[model samples]
Target: MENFQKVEKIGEGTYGVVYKARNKLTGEVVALKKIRTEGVPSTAIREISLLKELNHPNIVKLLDVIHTENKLYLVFEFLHQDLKKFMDASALTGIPLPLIKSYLFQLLQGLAFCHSHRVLHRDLKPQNLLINTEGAIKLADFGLARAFGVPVRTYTHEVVTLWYRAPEILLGCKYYSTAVDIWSLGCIFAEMVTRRALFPGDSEIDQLFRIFRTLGTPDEVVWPGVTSMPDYKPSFPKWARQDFSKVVPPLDEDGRSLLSQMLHYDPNKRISAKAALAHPFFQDVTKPVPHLRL
Candidate 1:
């Protein structure tokens, strides 16, 4: 604990309080999250265990875990700011398409890696996406994330934030997959382009309605077994499907197409992170850069 000098409190969540710290010996900046030992939350255990196994450039690095008398401090590689802050700061100047593309690409790549490893990042809003000065994005905050194995399991519908949540989960679908993360990515992509949330609903029901209003209400034909969910509502006002291009005006045809797939009504129909990375929208972005021989 004495190895690092506390700089300032950076964040506070249900499980712990995070601080920006400087390692005294190494002179390196890091995030120190202090988890108090008052019947330690299960989410904390899940987050710690999962982070130990996830090693990717796009995901936050957990440097070390320190245990004291009554607390646990998790040391993480420091990041300058989160995506939400970056977007807010650029609200006046407007985020460039190239930058937006880079951020979204990194987001998908990181998510693909997580899904490949059988992990699901249930909470994937901009607030959880950390950004460095080099324009590199790293996925952070694994408190709500969990690893799922074969013979699919049922998960909580109240996992993701209201705005970025998938319709299937929002409408009481307990058995979900990585498609939920893709749905959140779609919302994030729209927010980055438009500088506002696509569905900023005040309540859960309102959130579902906002999605329905934009994409049109789901039907048995569109999403099989949707009506059988516990909270399924058949009395929702009929809404005609609207063009996604209008929702995200800055996106090109390829960008719009990819976004549409990500925001599909059916979880089964939504694009996977790996498949999204292979989309034409990322053709130029994913192209290998040439190195000059000196």
Candidate 2:
């Protein structure tokens, strides 16, 4: 704390508030995320470990780590704003299509790197995205288990966001997959277009309803083991899959095609982040970015 001067509060997270701060020693502005710990948050430990290795141009760069008895300062590259705050400020006539497209491109680049290295970002909401003035976006927050897990909570306000959660996770599917993040990508992509959440759920069960009411309820025919899931309800109401074209008329067919795949019901079949970079929507991108397709 002596080396840095607190600027102002930028945002909040599950553990504590983050601030924009400056290095008094060298005068470098950085994001200082403070994790208030009475017992010490293992969440902070996990994030630090994962971020230390999960390096990429599209991921937030962890600069330094400082901690005292009551709080920890996780220093990171400070960016202009988050995707949520960006959208709010730029919502004049919906963000320019290409600008939105660019974030999704960079988003998948970081995500592909995560999946390629066996890390799951678990949380992938707008606020978790940091946007730069140079048209760059970095994925923030971090580090779930190797691949999968069931809901760690029943859904709560101070816990984490529910709207970006995958249908399988909402249904208590323990052995979920990287596809969970893909589902989150689908929600984020859709929100970019509509300027609102695709399925803004109120709770765990209600999240499922929001998903089903929009994309049609999952069944064994479509989701195979959905009925056997830990929280599956047989009495779940059903609907037919709606044309994504209807929801995002402004999105090209290629964009809609990729969205539908990201939002696919079956984790087994949901498009991998790497594969998504090759979707027809991004066929015109000059660089594959991240360099190696593997």
Candidate 3:
């Protein structure tokens, strides 16, 4: 507590309160997360253990972890702006195609590292992605496991990020894998290009319909065993695929193709982050992809 001065309350994190602070000796500004709990929450432990193993440029670094009786502090590299806020600010000039590609590329690279290690970033949205002025985006508040903890505000309602939920999860499929995160990347990529969320729904059910309407309602042909899932409904309205080029006009043919693969109905067929890195959408990208100056 004495090592860093608590500057101000920044925001509420996934499982605790986060603050912006400055180191006493080094003068390094850092985001400090304080978890006030009885026993250290399993989610915090899970996050700590997982982040310790993950070392990547695209992933946010965990700087320090300090425990004092009932309170736990997690120190992380401070980046004031998130992808959502950053995107909002970019609306003035509009984000460039090259810039979007760079951000999406970094996202894929980070996700590829997680998926390669057999870890899934269950919660992925623009709000949870951190970005510095250098245009370096990083994955944050990841490491969700088999079970989820209730949100701090309401014990009855868990924090359900509806718009980014994969179709399988919406259909009550319990055996989802890395594809869940991939689905989110597809949505995120679309937003970067369109300046609008690919599927923005008010509720979980609304979210499913939004996705179904846009990507075409899934069936056995598109997603085998989809109809057999727990929440599948025969009464849902049927729709066919919409033209990707028309949906996101600014994206090139290759970018559209890559998005299609990512948003594929079947998790098994969806493009993996590792394979996506080599896609033609990124062919002209620099060898050492430079982080754009925002």
Candidate 4:
């Protein structure tokens, strides 16, 4: 609104443009997301409603919402960068193991809070994870999120980014749960260590193949009802599972184990965020500075 001055454009997405702004009165920096008010999209409404209910250390806080003549602006606490940008900047030398554990722990903690509140962040990617120099990481971008109930809800499979999408959704399974987000965490967990995308695919088929090539093609024995998926492919080339040590060589055994559990083919078998928080992978990360262990 009139009280904030836009310093520069930070990014743009389907909803609107994001600007780095400073509050004229308070002198505090903030990210202003300007949403056109031609007609409020469901994603916009969902984001606003969900963000209002979520208030946690690891979740981005919605400072305020402004309504102008033709535009709606969302004010958020400004973060220095996103996880993707941070990872890219550290490309030459991979992220330190301790830092990786801390980041992963915070990510799971935030997700655990969301899941406990019955909110599902259908889209989870490094680009949506905001981080500050202090090593604090917060989950952002709730436009694609949904609050669910216990009646076996059916959802659209058109959620999540390609590389981080879960196998169930990619295979056209309309009914899913928070497990999809866990799958994304698996992809992110590896990328944090490797400094590269785990599965950078061009299309749905390509994405599915990338996952299969890494974890091996799923069958009924390993993943029950996999063959029943609407988009399930019968002739996917058989690929033996690649060792986690080779994929994420620097990660310790406990970390590798957690990654496998998160990327499990059967959503039901995937590790929950709450359980992941207690995994041995984070044992070295102390309580006080869990986000900056290294």
Candidate 5:
């Protein structure tokens, strides 16, 4: 195993503790993630096997793996900070619209690649998006991510970090697609444009209702096979139409228009990450990030 010099604990991650470390041979800075085994080999093994095959510029780079002391260590390329810290820093408040577009576009690029590779990032949120000093955004944390669509079997819809969850999952829908990530991306897109979280629903029920009110509830015809879910529960006090412009009160016309498309109610009709990257909203971006690195 290669030696990794510990630089101290960086922060608590979704399923482990992240540390800033340096490689012994090449002196490369990397983020080493220490996942507490707790004797659950499946979890750690699943993460390692999946991450080993996922290679993309917008996705966190897995440097190497080390095994010893009855624990699993997943080493990664070091990053400056994630969207959580970036959003908290006073210097990042009221981010520029252009910059926000750039970030979202890059995020979509990453998501598109994942979808194409048959991997579904069930857990996508600000905290999982890492940025470096060069302003590049990469998706991180694959412990909660898995490859779905294996003939549509029952899955633990108990994924995603609440605010980023799609309504289908909230309503107990099991058979889903990469649309889940698109929903989360929509939330991220809004947060970027407004410099604040769009949906801050406190409870699970309330969160579903908030989304229902904004995007209108989905009928059986809209989301076929939804009634088969184990937790299928109809929405209450169903409303017709939503004032999206008022929902995101801080955004301009163009920005609101773009968000409306991203957060559409129909998963099948939802915009794909590939199309979102080509959005005109990012036309004037500085570098004009591509849909894929290559």
Candidate 6:
């Protein structure tokens, strides 16, 4: 780590300042995330544990770790940029259907890899997803990630970003599974296809209702325990009547098809990451995007 020369700082992340650096020996560029070490640094441990378990093409590579007396540095493969940068550089005003398809396919591939390893990328957003030179999206930032195995039905609504959080979490449903990630995937898919957020809400109630308005409120028959959650409450009198065609006007047939499956109001019936990758949207997927290779 000492030999790795300091390069320009990338930017401040959720918990630290990210910098671009290179190893002196191999000259391999690396991302150094300098984070403050507070009382019992669980985030660092969490990141290391999860990333160590996930070694896949679509996942960010954790190259090494550096510990100092006052701070901890998480070394990562220095990807050229993240999704946010791509959006800005490409003048991505109205996200094209094919580009959206490319990004969503790669993201789902990464998610499927994580799910296979029994891990969940609890926090997913454009900022946390890196886009390498080849345009592939890699899932990064595992500090809030966790593993979910044999379900015993006990959980909390502590994880997941607000925009991507599932309705179950909003309703205070304790036991969650990979289905939560699928919900987040649905949000991301919608964002990409529309070039804007589907439910950009500031509160849980508004977020849930925003989703309900489009996907419709789930009934007990569709989603069991639909009204028993801690924060469960009825919204408007009418359920979703918005036509999918109007909601995402630009999305092609394949894109709409996959988005619907990913956003299935009934999480129990949502598509798995692997199944999603195999969906007709990616019928042309023949090679892993370049970003994933690094």
Taking all chains together, the TM-score of candidate 2 against the true structure is 0.87
For model 2, state the Cα shift of residue 115 in Å: 1.2
Which lDDT values do the candidates have, in the order given? 0.78, 0.77, 0.80, 0.79, 0.72, 0.72
Q: Please, what are the lDDT tens digits per residue for candidate 6 over residues 149-231?
A: 21212133223346788888778887777888888878877776667778887777778888788777777777787777787
lDDT of 1 by residue, 1-294 (tens): 799899998875433578999999999999987753265555565667767878899989888777565557788899878888877878887678777787789888898887887778776788878877656888986534442221112232223357887887777777778888899989999998899899998788999899989998888899888889889977888888898878999789999999999988888889999888889988877322211111
Question: Among these predicted structures, which one has the highest TM-score?
Answer: 3
lDDT by residue (tens digit), candidate 2, 1-294: 888899998765654578889999879999887654165566656656666766799988888777666557778888877788777766777777777778788889999997887778777889888876667889876562231132444223355668899888788777667788899989999998988789888878888888898789888888898899888988888777777878777888898889989988999889999998888898665322121111
Better of 1 and 2 by lDDT: 1
- Candidate 6 local accuracy as lDDT? 0.72
Task: Give per-model TM-scores.
Answer: 0.86, 0.87, 0.89, 0.87, 0.83, 0.82
Q: Name model 1 segments beyond 4 Å from true.
A: 36-38, 41-47, 147-161, 286-294
Candidate 1 global TM-score: 0.86
**RMSD (Cα, Å) of candidate 5?**
5.8
What digit string (tens of lDDT, one per residue) describes model 3 on residues 1-294? 899999998875565678899999889999887754367676666666666668888888778777666567878888877888777877767677887888888899999998888878777888889977666889976664332342424232345467787889888898879999999999988888888888988777898989877889998898998889999999989988788987887888999999999999899999999999999999876433333354
Q: What lDDT is obtained when candidate 5 is compared to the true structure?
A: 0.72
Which model, 2 or 5, shows the larger TM-score?
A: 2
Q: What pairs collide in candidate 3?
A: none
* Candidate number achieving the greatest lDDT relative to the actual structure: 3
Candidates in order: C-alpha RMSD to true structure? 6.1, 5.2, 3.0, 5.3, 5.8, 5.6
Between prediction 1 and prediction 5, the one with superior TM-score is 1
Residue range 173-240, candidate 4, lDDT tens digits: 88779899999989998888877889998788899999889899999989999998999878778888
Taking the tens digit of each residue's C-alpha lDDT, what string does model 5 give over 218-270?
66676676566566665366656678776776677767777777787778878
For candidate 5, the per-residue lDDT at 146 reads 47
- Those runs of model 2 whose alpha carbons end farther than 4 Å from true positions after fitting are 37-47, 144-159, 286-294
TM-score of 6: 0.82
lDDT of 4 at 167: 86
